């Protein structure tokens, strides 16, 4: 359907994992923390999608 | 590459439009993320940049 997207607003570091966690912002103004891939920058948009 | 995880649980909170899914990543780590409507338990989701 419509692409499920969120804007990356902050990039944090998870020390347990050596991996980035982005603070993201949904269309309704909700903000959550997600594991993201490498190469994500603040200001990008990420999609969650079935494979 | 392809950053993926398998939906283990899925819950519709009447408080938001999108459902909350508990996903299992590569190493076994589990977290709660918002998924699109129509994700069912057992699906694999991908987090990618657009």
Author numbering:
A (entry chain F): 5 to 55
B (entry chain A): 6 to 55
Paper excerpt:
Here, we study fold transition between distinct β-barrels by protein engineering and structural biology technique. Here, we discover that the previously reconstructed ancient DPBB sequence could also adopt a β-barrel fold named Double-Zeta β-barrel (DZBB), as a metamorphic protein. The DZBB fold is not found in any modern protein, although its structure shares similarities with RIFT and OB. Furthermore, the reconstructed OB fold could also be converted to the four-stranded SH3 fold by a simple circular permutation. Thus, these ancient β-barrel folds (DPBB, RIFT, OB, and SH3) could be readily interconverted by a few feasible mutations through the missing-link fold, DZBB, indicating their significantly close evolutionary relationships.
To examine what determines the DZBB–OB transition, additional intermediates have been engineered by sequential mutagenesis and experimental validation steps (design-12–17).
